[PDB]
Amino acid sequence: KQFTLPDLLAMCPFTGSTNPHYAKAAAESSAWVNSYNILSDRKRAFFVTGSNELLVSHTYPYAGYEQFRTCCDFVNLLFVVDEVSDDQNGQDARQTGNVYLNAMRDPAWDDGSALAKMTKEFRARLLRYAGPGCYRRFLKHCEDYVDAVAREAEYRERGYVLDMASFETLRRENSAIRLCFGLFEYVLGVDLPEGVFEDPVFMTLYWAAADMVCWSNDVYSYNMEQAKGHSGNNIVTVLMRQKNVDLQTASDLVGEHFATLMDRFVTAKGGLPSWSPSVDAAVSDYVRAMEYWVTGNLEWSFETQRYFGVMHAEIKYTRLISLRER
Ligand SMILES: [Mg+2]
Ligand SMILES: [Mg+2]
Ligand SMILES: [Mg+2]
Ligand SMILES: [Mg+2]
């Protein structure tokens, strides 16, 4: 019937912010993405009502105009890929992701579609400034994202629900959070040393914030996803199945895991090595950028209509979810 969300904002010690360029870059980005005909009229109606750019405002509130607009275009592009592939079988979703992937990776490749052209335009923005390290890893993130979205579609169409360990590997990639973290070096204007990405403390912070985003998105989006038969790619479903618990308990377990990840993130922050004044300053800005993503994703979730409907503002305070019919 109903359940209550875990109180994730109460567990978040970070102070959220928004981007002052939101009004102008969002109008530009929304006009850009809507210049393409790719979604059904019903999907369009929800898409243009989802406040996609507001998510970017909350999660990259420090971005300068140029970089912020690029992030808006990118998140709008991801939402397009997501909503198109949601309505597709496994082979069609794999082809959709491969349009994005080839357009990103191969400067010659353009199959003529609206999605290819959209990807090429974001790509040209990214490549104005992105460093060789950031871009090389971004393309690797692109391939992992596409493979995970395609496999999500295959498993959805077959009814297969992954075991929790396999689910987390897949969800980390098909949530696109690694792509979004992958723009930090672009937004901040500087590549991190490749050695930083295999520091054990930095890896701990990276994965704790990525998982916080994944698990909080899952418990928030569960209602809308189960109502459209999409609940297989969701930790709530995985927990009910494999731990044999009911919905409120799975919700409670999301909250316990979120608190564990947040504690690990905050306690790990202090153990960060020091490499040099300039590297340390850049690393610190990257770590603050993960904090803004964790906090901004939470805040946006209660500002958009995407997960909670038109009464989303009230749900922020009651956390009471009534399950939607099919
Ligand atoms: Mg989705
Ligand atoms: Mg996502
Ligand atoms: Mg979701
Ligand atoms: Mg999905």
Side-chain angles (χ1 to χ4, degrees):
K1 35 160 52 75
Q2 314 173 318
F3 80 103
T4 73
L5 304 167
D7 191 355
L8 305 182
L9 279 174
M11 313 177 187
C12 190
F14 310 128
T15 297
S17 182
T18 49
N19 198 294
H21 306 287
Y22 168 73
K24 197 61 48 222
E28 284 189 353
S29 190
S30 159
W32 169 78
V33 68
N34 276 305
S35 92
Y36 291 83
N37 193 318
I38 50 195
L39 288 180
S40 76
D41 194 7
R42 207 202 148 166
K43 278 272 196 183
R44 170 152 103 261
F46 280 98
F47 183 103
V48 312
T49 320
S51 310
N52 291 348
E53 302 82 4
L54 199 42
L55 172 55
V56 186
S57 182
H58 279 277
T59 54
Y60 307 86
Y62 51 89
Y65 185 88
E66 167 84 352
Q67 289 72 26
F68 180 73
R69 161 74 199 278
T70 300
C71 284
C72 285
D73 288 8
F74 182 61
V75 165
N76 264 319
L77 173 51
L78 293 172
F79 271 106
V80 164
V81 173
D82 201 57
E83 295 298 296
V84 164
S85 54
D86 269 4
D87 293 334
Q88 280 178 328
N89 66 44
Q91 301 144 32
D92 287 337
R94 180 168 290 288
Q95 262 322 115
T96 288
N98 279 336
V99 170
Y100 166 84
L101 176 56
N102 285 275
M104 276 302 308
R105 188 164 55 202
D106 183 355
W109 193 101
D110 187 334
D111 69 348
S113 57
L115 179 59
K117 188 189 198 227
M118 180 178 299
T119 302
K120 285 310 206 198
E121 282 169 353
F122 158 76
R123 175 184 189 271
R125 288 189 68 87
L126 178 66
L127 279 180
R128 285 163 205 186
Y129 301 122
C134 164
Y135 189 69
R136 182 181 156 287
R137 287 179 259 105
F138 187 87
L139 292 179
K140 291 171 127 169
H141 295 318
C142 290
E143 196 175 37
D144 293 334
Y145 165 71
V146 162
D147 182 53
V149 169
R151 291 213 265 128
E152 173 194 353
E154 299 162 6
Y155 301 152
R156 182 180 63 239
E157 71 175 324
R158 298 161 37 186
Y160 179 52
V161 181
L162 275 168
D163 73 277
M164 212 184 316
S166 316
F167 171 65
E168 291 202 67
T169 302
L170 198 73
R171 178 61 179 152
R172 280 163 170 187
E173 308 301 329
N174 62 40
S175 73
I177 194 55
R178 305 196 66 189
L179 286 159
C180 287
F181 287 7
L183 300 171
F184 288 174
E185 294 168 291
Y186 160 82
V187 172
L188 300 168
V190 58
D191 282 349
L192 292 186
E194 300 299 311
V196 170
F197 292 105
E198 36 183 28
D199 173 70
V201 175
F202 179 89
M203 298 189 290
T204 295
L205 303 171
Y206 179 97
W207 285 120
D211 290 344
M212 280 191 269
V213 170
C214 283
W215 281 65
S216 61
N217 173 261
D218 279 0
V219 71
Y220 291 165
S221 62
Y222 174 74
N223 190 19
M224 85 144 189
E225 278 167 10
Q226 63 79 28
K228 56 200 211 174
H230 273 74
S231 61
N233 199 60
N234 189 301
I235 195 70
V236 175
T237 308
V238 175
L239 293 156
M240 297 197 289
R241 291 210 161 201
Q242 276 136 68
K243 293 189 179 304
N244 203 41
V245 297
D246 69 350
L247 175 60
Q248 188 56 57
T249 301
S251 172
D252 297 345
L253 289 163
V254 167
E256 180 209 6
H257 195 64
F258 193 95
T260 302
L261 298 174
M262 182 65 79
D263 278 326
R264 188 41 168 162
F265 187 96
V266 295
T267 60
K269 261 185 67 169
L272 256 192
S274 167
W275 294 285
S276 71
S278 59
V279 171
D280 288 7
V283 168
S284 282
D285 290 350
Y286 190 111
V287 173
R288 201 187 288 115
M290 292 191 291
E291 307 180 353
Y292 275 126
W293 246 102
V294 175
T295 307
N297 173 60
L298 296 187
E299 301 166 333
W300 170 76
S301 294
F302 294 100
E303 282 184 347
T304 183
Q305 292 140 0
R306 187 185 177 75
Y307 311 125
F308 308 125
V310 300
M311 302 316 289
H312 59 86
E314 285 181 6
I315 304 309
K316 187 177 190 202
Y317 306 102
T318 72
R319 281 178 285 114
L320 175 73
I321 307 298
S322 302
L323 294 195
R324 226 161 289 198
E325 211 205 300
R326 291 301 144 144

